[PDB]
């Protein structure tokens, strides 16, 4: 393996998302052959002079004939006149695209192209947001850096593997990179209402964002003191033209709890910024910027945001101690009694069962249902003991502050530290009677109490008792054991999957085939769409009562009541009673009604949100800000404009082009679901009364959807098989842990097509 | 009438006791006997520690200067841990320690200590914090049957 290097990695808040810090010493070892050209005769000349020992240098100069002049040993190392055509093997310099990768690599996102940034001290350095797609942490991980050796090869990397081009991944059709750890924790604190910054600090923060225009935003407060909002300055890192709407539990347009999120023209208007906004979440800010501004601009976003928050976090500070794991004096009494209560419920089920009064649940032993109840009881305790502790912790509580932001920590963690640790267990049951009729020699025989059989009342804070300790080690070992297993079994499955699909590719006829040329799918994914361009969207027409459906979509020009009020439309009053148009409006409505029927068949469930291409709701929100559309004046749209316009757009959303009848039908099928979404978003009443689009904004919305759509089609040449294998295998290397077979053992049963399932079940309605 | 800070324990409803543990902390082996407050730690974590103690540097022996072994790592200034164990005595840990008491601050600082990395005091490094000796020794003989 030539032209590669490996070393320990370290995170770096000052590198850009797509850069890789390459220690200077490793940069002198890896070379790149570059032909002598007038565009570089000087740079190269200069390098050769520096030689193999100085950085911007080179190790060899190769002349026409193919002669290799060694710069480290050569009486002419300082007397060389490079000539056009020669090649100079120079050291890798700043900005060369290099392939950085971390094993085991079961993802494509685990082998991405980076831009070199030569630096001092050893160890490679990564931006903290490129950490998750590599599943790397800096407790000793090492990574490989491969140097593309040719000109075509260089391009291939920076045009295909470049980190920015991988932000939105096809594996789950959402970003695979987001703001994390420190920046996440800080971005929240920085966005609270109670966060203000003074002139002197604002200026540094502003100056920290490298894409700042030097225009000091006007204070949110000018009064007794020029004071800025935490939200204000962050909004500087966000580029113009970015809009984003999200409503949480009880978010109003006055979100009392500073809930949700509203961003308009790259300026946050309300809502704390946390994992739901700046994380690798679906509709999140990173997803939006990528799609609206491009991969390069989004990549810069990560660094801009990082730099602002990190700076602000460096001067605010954040920490965590034992204090944060301590629960109120009273809460501890409430928690103790909560368990003490579970030991009564369990004690009574015992006396019951010991009297032979418990009734076995059909298809279960007395002892089976006995255990069942004790386990339900104890867990309810553990749970309620945990919530009591959760509720208490103030907002000062650092553990809770991390949780509220998204970075590390969950309920289960807080609960085991502060309230009850829980019930240990091996093979889905309570600690077994290893000794004859007892768990430990310290108990008496036939003791099924919780203390005997493994329930750990104490929290980590309080400490475990010797018996609780051993039992917790028994449970502990079970996890270690199959972390070993799970580990192995998945590294072999992922390889079985790749092998089986590795040759499937999308061809120019939008077909998916294998090496023999056999058709696997007549159109990839049954829609010709590229997974990385699909977003969960709501198919409105499917939910709600019928009354709601008609109120929303029904336009009856022939009815003084169910018509378009002359205020929504310019030609509103002269359209009342118009028969010819009403025939157009009835084609549309009947079409909406079929759509609803149709959808109710495809999703018998009633589920409305499904990943589809082209986020229409966004295209509209743009239009409504781009054309400063005031919701007061009527629209200058004609009913013919909308109905015929939206009817024509559909004929332009192409996935297939063949001029024959067979392919044309394939084409109508591929675009069916999307068109259902389309027609429900651009239904006449919606456009006019809800969106309020003008003839101009509307015409823009249409051509945009057509553009985004075509930009969403999968490109022939896509190694869709390996893509699939890796999309299934990667997460299958994340399954570590209600009575059936799941996880790897099940996935393996499936892939094996095993005729002897372990849990053959029949579900009959 | 019970200290709320203590951990909760069960009763002594036993008039049958035939024996009594000398001390429960004795269920532990040598490695774990060096972990402070192992009973407040998550289970698998005690295990990971028991593996890493074997990768720490200390003073494997006092006669280290007289042995010519393949590899050796000696801490410049070994310290005894401020927080110890009763078992630690029979382990000669305070005698042949393997670590130092670093003054550690749990904080988000320049952001250069995320995802498990650490920010260390360059100044403390100068004064000797954590320096160590490393001894590698090579061997080689002469001919055979010829």
């Amino acid at each position: 393996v030539d032209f590669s290097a490996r070393t320990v990695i370290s995170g770096d808040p000052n590198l850009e998302l797509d850069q890789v810090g390459v220690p200077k010493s490793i940069a002198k070892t890896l070379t790149y052959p570059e032909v002598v050209t007038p565009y570089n005769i000087d740079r190269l000349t200069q390098l050769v002079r520096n030689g193999p020992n100085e950085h911007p240098g080179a190790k060899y100069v190769i002349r026409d004939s193919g002669d290799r002049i060694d710069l480290r040993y050569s009486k002419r190392a300082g007397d060389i006149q490079l000539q056009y055509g020669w090649k100079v093997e120079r050291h890798i310099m700043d900005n060369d695209p290099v392939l950085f990768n971390r094993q085991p690599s079961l993802h494509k996102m685990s082998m991405m192209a980076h831009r070199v940034k030569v630096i001092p001290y050893s160890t490679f350095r990564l931006n903290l947001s490129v950490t998750s797609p590599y599943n790397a942490d800096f407790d000793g991980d090492e990574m490989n850096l491969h140097v593309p050796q040719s000109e075509e090869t260089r391009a291939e990397l920076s045009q295909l593997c470049a980190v920015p081009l991988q932000i939105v991944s096809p594996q789950s059709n959402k970003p695979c990179m987001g703001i994390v750890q420190d920046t996440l924790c800080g971005i929240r604190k920085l966005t609270l209402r109670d966060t203000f910054i003074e002139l002197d600090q604002v200026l540094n923060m502003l100056y920290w964002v490298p894409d700042w225009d030097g225009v000091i935003p006007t204070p949110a407060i000018i009064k007794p003191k020029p004071l800025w909002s935490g939200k204000q300055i962050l909004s500087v890192a966000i580029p113009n033209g970015i809009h984003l709407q999200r409503f949480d539990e009880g978010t109003t347009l006055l979100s009392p709890k500073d809930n949700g999120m509203l961003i308009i023209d790259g300026q946050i208007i309300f809502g704390v910024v946390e994992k739901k906004t700046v994380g690798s979440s679906n509709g999140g800010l990173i997803h939006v910027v990528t799609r609206e501004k491009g991969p390069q601009v989004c990549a810069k976003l990560f660094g801009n945001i990082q730099k602002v928050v990190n700076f602000w976090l460096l001067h605010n500070g954040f920490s965590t101690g034992i204090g944060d794991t301590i629960a109120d004096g009273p809460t501890m009494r409430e928690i103790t009694e909560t368990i003490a209560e579970a030991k009564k419920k369990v004690l009574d089920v015992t006396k019951e069962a010991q009297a032979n009064l418990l009734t076995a649940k059909h298809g279960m032993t007395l002892r089976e249902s006995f255990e069942d109840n004790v386990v339900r009881f104890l867990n309810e305790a553990r749970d309620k003991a945990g919530r009591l502790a959760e509720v208490n912790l103030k907002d000062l509580n650092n553990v809770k502050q991390m949780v509220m932001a998204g970075s590390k920590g969950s309920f289960i963690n807080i609960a085991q530290m502060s309230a009850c640790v829980g019930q240990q267990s091996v093979e889905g049951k309570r600690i077994a009677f290893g000794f004859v009729d007892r768990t430990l020699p310290h108990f008496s025989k036939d003791d099924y109490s919780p203390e005997s059989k493994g329930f750990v009342e104490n929290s980590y804070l309080r400490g475990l008792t010797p018996q609780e300790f051993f039992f917790h080690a028994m449970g502990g070992r079970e996890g270690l054991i199959d972390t070993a297993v799970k580990t192995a079994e998945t590294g072999y499955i992922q390889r079985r999957l790749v092998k089986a699909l590795e040759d499937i590719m999308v061809h120019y006829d939008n077909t998916t085939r294998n090496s023999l040329g056999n058709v696997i799918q007549f159109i990839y994914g049954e829609d010709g769409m590229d997974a990385a361009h699909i977003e969960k969207q709501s198919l409105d027409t499917i939910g709600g009562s019928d009354a709601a459906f008609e109120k929303r979509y029904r336009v009856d020009l022939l009815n003084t009541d169910h018509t378009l009020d002359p205020s929504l439309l310019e030609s509103g009053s002269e359209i009342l009673g118009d028969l010819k148009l009403q025939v157009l409006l009835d084609e549309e409505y009947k079409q909406l009604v079929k759509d609803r029927k149709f959808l109710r068949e495809v999703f018998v469930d009633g589920e409305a949100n499904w990943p589809l291409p082209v986020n229409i709701r966004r295209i509209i929100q743009n239009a409504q800000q781009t054309f400063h559309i005031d919701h007061t004046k009527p629209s200058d749209l004609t009913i013919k404009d909308i109905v015929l316009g939206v009817k024509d757009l559909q004929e332009n959303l192409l996935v297939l082009r063949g001029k024959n009848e067979i392919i044309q039908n394939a084409q109508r099928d591929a675009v069916t679901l999307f068109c259902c979404l389309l027609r429900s978003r651009l239904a006449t009443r919606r456009v006019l009364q809800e969106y309020r689009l003008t003839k101009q904004a509307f015409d823009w919305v249409l051509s945009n959807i057509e553009a985004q759509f075509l930009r969403s089609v999968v490109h022939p040449g896509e190694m869709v098989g390996v893509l699939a294998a890796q999309s299934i295998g990667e997460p299958a290397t994340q399954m570590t842990l209600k009575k059936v077979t799941s996880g790897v053992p099940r996935l393996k049963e499936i892939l094996n097509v095993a005729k002897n399932m372990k849990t053959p079940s029949l579900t009959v309605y | 009438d019970v200290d709320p800070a203590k951990r909760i324990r069960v009763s002594h409803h036993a008039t049958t006791f035939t024996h009594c543990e000398i001390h429960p902390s004795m269920i532990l082996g040598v490695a774990a006997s060096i972990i402070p407050f192992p009973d407040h730690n998550q289970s698998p974590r005690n295990t990971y520690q028991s593996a890493m103690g074997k990768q720490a540097m200390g003073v494997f022996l006092t006669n280290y200067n007289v042995r010519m072994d393949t590899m050796a790592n000696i801490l410049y200034y070994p310290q005894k841990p401020l927080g110890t164990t009763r078992a630690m005595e029979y382990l000669k840990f305070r005698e042949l320690p393997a670590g130092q008491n670093a003054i550690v601050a749990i904080a988000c600082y320049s952001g250069y200590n995320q995802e498990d990395s650490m920010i260390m005091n360059q100044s403390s490094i100068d004064r000797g914090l954590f320096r160590s000796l490393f001894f590698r020794s090579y061997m080689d003989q002469e001919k055979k049957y010829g």
Binding site: I412, G422, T736 | -
Partner: peptide, 8 residues
């Protein structure tokens, strides 16, 4: 660690 229907 946690209990039944959870991790050991």
């Amino acid at each position: 660690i946690w209990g039944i229907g959870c991790n050991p």
